[PDB]
Structure 1
Amino acid sequence: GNVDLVFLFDGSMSLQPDEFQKILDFMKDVMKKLSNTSYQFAAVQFSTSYKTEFDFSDYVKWKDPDALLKHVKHMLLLTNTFGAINYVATEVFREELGARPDATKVLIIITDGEATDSGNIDAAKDIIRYIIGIGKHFQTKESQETLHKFASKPASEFVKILDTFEKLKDLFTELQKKIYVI
């Protein structure tokens, strides 16, 4: 039961330095909690374009979330979520980059705005997809609904709407209550 998990994180211009860091901290928190397990990780920043900040092979080598994310540079551009999810599916979940054949694939998408592009995420549909939408851009129910298409079903399970970046701590608290030895 191997799990290959990718964090796909928003690096758009809307994000303040502390908000961007809170996103990184949440990613680190999850990885640290799941150290020395069947989980292996990759992280991809997305804005207008995409950057694999570290891949699965990097994670195996270092096993240190602080070191792996120490040299991330905030892109400060747009929010091309469709393109980003497609990039993960076709350019990140790859054996060449340390992905394990037949592993359970998981995506955690973290964003603070509506997608600035369009299309489909068919290429990523076999990945278990969570999306975390954070902050004032997701005030309306309408804006929150736009995230449903990116996530696995039902949205009640896979879509998390947080009013503040501080709430990432509370989300991590909740997530950990779902951790079991099987």
Structure 2
Amino acid sequence: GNVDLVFLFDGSMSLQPDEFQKILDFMKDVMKKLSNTSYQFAAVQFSTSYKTEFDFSDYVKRKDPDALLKHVKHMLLLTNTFGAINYVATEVFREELGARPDATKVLIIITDGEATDSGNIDAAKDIIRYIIGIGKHFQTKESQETLHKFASKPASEFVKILDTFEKLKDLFTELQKKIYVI
């Protein structure tokens, strides 16, 4: 059926220009591969606060990813992941913003550090959540574990730990192996 997918991407101070761009490129990669399908997208940048870079309606209006993400400006602040996920659940997955009531909601969270806030993401639990943790800040098993609470279960399936930003291309190569005409 229809799938409404939101890319919630980290725009923290830790990110170097090329790493940030690499996060954005993975997003573009997935979009252009899934162009003209039942998939519809929205992208939200999060750091201390949040910004819907383009919503579902924007996407359908002009499906071009490079264009849709042209005005993105790296926030360079903190990593308030709990608030960010809640913002997506209540402020992005909305009909007035182009979300289809029927669609399966999917969230792809991309981050390079532990959340700088706390609370709960109860309001977003019906959304299928994937989280990609990248870089040195996720060197230890402990840091990696902290991400499980944001993603769907099992974590072995929904949580992806990447050692480098370059590995995003690797991740894209693998996700494509899972594309099928059904």
TM-score scaled to structure 1, two decimals?
1.00
How big is each residue's C-alpha offset from its partner over 1:145-181, in whole Å with a ceiling of 9 and x where there is no partner?
0000000000000000000000000000000000000
How big is each residue's C-alpha offset from its partner over 1:22-43, in whole Å with a ceiling of 9 and x where there is no partner?
0000000000000000000000
1:138-149 aligned at under 5 Å gives the runs 138-149=138-149
Q: Share of identical aligned residues, percent?
A: 99
Runs of 4+ in 1 over 4 A off after TM superposition: none
Question: 1:8 Cα deviation (Å)?
Answer: 0.0
Q: Distance in 1 between matches of 2:29 and 2:103?
A: 22
Partner of 2:126: 126
How big is each residue's C-alpha offset from its partner over 1:6-62, in whole Å with a ceiling of 9 and x where there is no partner?
000000000000000000000000000000000000000000000000000000000
Partner of 1:165: 165
Give SS of 1:180's match: coil
Give SS of 1:48's match: coil
RMSD (Å), alpha carbons: 0.3
TM-score scaled to structure 2, two decimals?
1.00
Question: 1:102 Cα deviation (Å)?
Answer: 1.8
Q: Which runs of 5+ in 1 are unaligned?
A: none
Q: Distance in 2 between matches of 1:71 and 1:95?
A: 23
Q: Give the length in aligned residue pairs.
A: 182
Q: Which runs of 5+ in 2 are unaligned?
A: none
How big is each residue's C-alpha offset from its partner over 1:116-137, in whole Å with a ceiling of 9 and x where there is no partner?
0000000000000000000000
Question: 1:71 Cα deviation (Å)?
Answer: 1.1
Q: Distance in 2 between matches of 1:105 and 1:32?
A: 19
How big is each residue's C-alpha offset from its partner over 1:75-110, in whole Å with a ceiling of 9 and x where there is no partner?
000000000000000000000100001210000000
Question: 1:144 Cα deviation (Å)?
Answer: 0.1
Give SS of 1:6's match: strand
